[PDB]
Design a protein around this ligand. Structure first.
Ligand SMILES: *[C@@H]1O[C@H](CO)[C@@H](O[C@@H]2O[C@H](CO)[C@@H](O[C@@H]3O[C@H](CO)[C@@H](O)[C@H](O)[C@H]3NC(C)=O)[C@H](O)[C@H]2NC(C)=O)[C@H](O)[C@H]1NC(C)=O
Ligand SMILES: *[C@@H]1O[C@H](CO)[C@@H](O[C@@H]2O[C@H](CO)[C@@H](O[C@@H]3O[C@H](CO)[C@@H](O)[C@H](O)[C@H]3NC(C)=O)[C@H](O)[C@H]2NC(C)=O)[C@H](O)[C@H]1NC(C)=O
Lengths: 430, 53, 430
């Protein structure tokens, strides 16, 4: 009875399959993939952030040169300068006039915001998707367990053992290269650690926040201070983290395909509704009811009464239940045409009880399996009026004949008329 | 151990791994005879000469 | 002069290319890829280790039943048992004889060795390869810097800026799924977290060492203690970590292809000699010598004297140097046929100095560029005798005519004789 089932990946709607174990009473499923959080395999490549030109205070030798050295600070820009007369609180102070030397030095350093307000690159691989699958199973009525997708993992939370996937729809909405910012995730071809052109994204490139080493292509170019005054012209591109916040691109939780949401959390991409998942469960046999205890319902009748050709469970149908005992009776349409709100219907001795459903074909010819008794609930449905609210329960759109059957049979009849005109020429011929 | 041209390595127990250059030793192709010295070229290429010949 | 160069991936041998900057004196390289440590992108999926059936001490109710409950311990196996008479230090102690009840309970727990002696699975992606490239450059004579492969990363350690790769030989010797043990790394299709069949590898599956939760399919089945005595039959598969240490497979540092070594360290795969790397350097122009200061060496002559058709630098050749000034002269064979031990040769006023080299073609017709003066060092070489030591400096094997030139020209001559027999029939014909 290990109920294999292909199953559409779509988050917020149950999938009430039916256990057709030969021998005991069937049991309904209610499989609602409440989440599809993904968590691909990734690597923190480098944080970036806006620089801070935290200038070390320049040297001023008063009469003669002070050669600078290339200190190992990140982007340690330093350039000696002469020809000053530095006004500092008493007019100038160095008594020479050209031998007055000024050595400006400036290096790049992570902002204090780099710790907290910082973009974040990644090389993103595929990893392994997850879900907090609720099943309000059978008569168990509850399990809300976190599972995987890899098609040999069980999760014995509750009483049932369930194996999921692997899904066929391997679209990781994340690209290979991704930038991340607070919550807005950008599938951006970040240049790399160690390279980013100044002004462009990643002018500062630190491996992490702690990492004292980094790459600071900021094009930091010191210029000489003006007219004999102490200061430090640092001519520099404002960061490619400054832009990338107001000339950026839009976020993947606002531009992704196939229906995903995002978090700066384990880097999941929630609720990506795409494709199917081959899911298979091993129910506890104790949860089964033996077949000789549920009422046999046959010699019944089913009919719609007001079928709504729609998403919300607007379709209804009375069923002339013809029971043997009285009790519960799990229900399901093995055809995917009709999706039913009720998993189970209570029964007195051969009464009648309407259920709710939703379909997509004007003439819903769907079987209904009322606890081992099939029936066609044939009929016709009506379109609604009021379509602006969240997502459907129908999810069964397919091909849905009033000018096709005798039309194309009539279309054929012209060319069918041919070879009964031709080869009757053969008879008139002989 | 049929060592190849580029190299092999060798691990005598937890004694450290060795490594070995085995280029030729079949003496290439000097020449003062008609053809029995060409074996040198065959002994270096006993896959392509069988078909190349 | 940004000297692009395709470059073979092979660890323990320099690659002494030559900077042909038009205008100033050329400079040799010496690029020795001392390491090729890889460090792919990975994910710790689950530690495994051998279990320890750390039995909690069973209950013994003396007259009547003690129903057990399914405690949440990993693989919490518990089974009530009756029909005992437990001999405990005074003969039995429970005065009943069948109502004597014994409740055995046992759960699986990480060994103390799990912290330290433990296999370790991984989902392994590709990541980014590295190297401590020494260049004893030019006259700089030193830099031993750690670099990357991604083809826009510089590493300004020393004075030169160098961009490496991306390599074309993307064979990650690691497979997708890998198990790791201490130092022996196994490219094993570990089943998964949460699934591993008992006895098989990963019977215990803990996310990490700290993780109190795990998956313990050990097939732990308690049996009733015998003949009214206190003990706990735990019937269990010894671990798939017990096997996997003596019925395992061999390690990837003993079965990999294309020449790799391994460490339980950042999960690198060192020294993987395969393919080429498109490497490009921006030399410091200060390190250049202008062309008008090195001796011009032309009107020279080169000849082998004892060429060794081999790997070690057995090939030698005197060169009748014909200089203008006297000094150093960097050397290189732009043809890859000959690999030379000397980067630089000192010169008096038009002397002679032999160098060492190694080749692979019987008739080495390789150019030699003695600081802007080319020369063919044509000759003939001798095979060695003594081939059992580590790896070569030659690494230049290619196609290497004594019965091919006039042979196939003679082979052709038969079929060339054809169309000068044919179409001369046309003349005799007219
Ligand atoms: C399991 O599948 C169910 C599919 O509908 C969902 O579970 C729902 O959980 C809700 C909160 O636990 C319940 O709401 C409560 O219902 C009771 C009984 O009707 C009310 O008294 C409470 O007021 C109400 N709570 C609130 C805040 O209104 C739902 O009843 C319950 N669903 C059903 C059908 O009973 C979830 O999708 C899923 N559970 C998960 C993911 O935890
Ligand atoms: C740089 O490329 C060089 C290629 O040969 C290698 O660098 C080698 O480093 C060794 C240790 O620093 C040197 O050995 C020392 O050499 C001096 C001078 O000859 C001797 O006095 C010392 O005794 C000797 N040390 C020992 C322990 O014997 C080598 O001389 C030096 N190579 C050359 C050509 O000078 C390395 O491959 C690379 N350096 C790295 C990776 O750090």
């Amino acid at each position: 009875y290990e109920h294999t089932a292909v199953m559409p990946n779509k988050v917020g709607i149950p999938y009430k399959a039916l256990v057709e174990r030969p021998g005991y009473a069937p049991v309904h499923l209610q499989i609602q993939l409440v989440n599809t959080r993904i968590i691909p395999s990734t690597n923190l490549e480098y944080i970036t952030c806006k620089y801070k030109t935290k200038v070390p205070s320049p040297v001023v030798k008063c009469c003669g040169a002070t050669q600078c050295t290339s200190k190992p600070h990140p982007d340690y820009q330093c350039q000696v300068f002469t020809g000053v007369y530095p006004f500092m609180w008493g007019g100038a102070y160095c008594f020479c006039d050209t031998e007055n030397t000024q050595m400006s030095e400036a290096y790049v350093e992570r902002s204090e915001e780099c710790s907290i307000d910082h973009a974040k690159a990644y090389k993103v691989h595929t990893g392994t998707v997850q879900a907090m699958v609720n099943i309000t199973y059978g008569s168990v009525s509850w399990r809300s367990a976190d599972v995987y997708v890899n098609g040999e993992t069980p999760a014995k939370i509750g009483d049932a053992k369930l194996i999921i996937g692997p899904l066929s729809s391997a679209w990781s909405p994340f690209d290979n290269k991704v930038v991340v910012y607070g919550h807005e995730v950008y599938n951006y071809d970040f240049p790399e650690y160690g390279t980013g052109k100044a002004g462009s994204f990643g002018d500062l490139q630190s491996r992490t926040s702690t990492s004292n080493d980094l790459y600071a292509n900021t094009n930091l170019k010191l210029q000489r201070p003006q007219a004999g005054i102490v200061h430090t012209p640092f001519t520099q591109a404002p960061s490619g983290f400054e832009r990338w916040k107001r000339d950026k691109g839009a976020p993947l939780n606002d531009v992704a395909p196939f229906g995903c949401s995002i978090a700066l959390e384990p880097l999941r991409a929630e609720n990506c509704a795409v494709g199917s998942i081959p899911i298979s469960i091993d129910i506890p046999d104790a949860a089964f009811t033996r077949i000789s205890e549920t009422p046999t319902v046959s010699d019944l009748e089913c009919k719609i009464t007001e079928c709504t050709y729609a998403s919300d469970f607007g379709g209804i149908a009375t069923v002339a239940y013809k029971s043997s005992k009285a009790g519960n009776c799990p229900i399901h349409s093995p055809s995917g045409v009709a999706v039913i709100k009720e998993n189970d219907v209570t029964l007195a001795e051969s009464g009648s009880f309407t259920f709710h459903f939703s379909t997509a074909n004007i003439h819903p010819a769907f079987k209904l399996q009322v606890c081992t008794s099939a029936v066609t609930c044939k009929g016709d449905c009506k379109p609604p009026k009021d379509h602006i609210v969240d997502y459907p329960a129908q999810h069964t759109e397919s091909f849905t004949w009033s000018w096709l059957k005798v039309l194309v049979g009539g279309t054929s009849a012209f060319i069918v008329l041919g070879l009964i005109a031709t080869a009757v020429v053969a008879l008139v011929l002989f | 151990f049929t060592v190849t041209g580029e190299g092999l390595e060798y691990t005598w127990g937890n004694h450290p791994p060795k490594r070995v250059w085995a280029q030729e030793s079949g003496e290439g192709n000097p020449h003062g005879w008609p053809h029995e010295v060409v074996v040198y070229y065959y002994n270096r290429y006993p896959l392509t000469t069988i078909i190349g010949l």
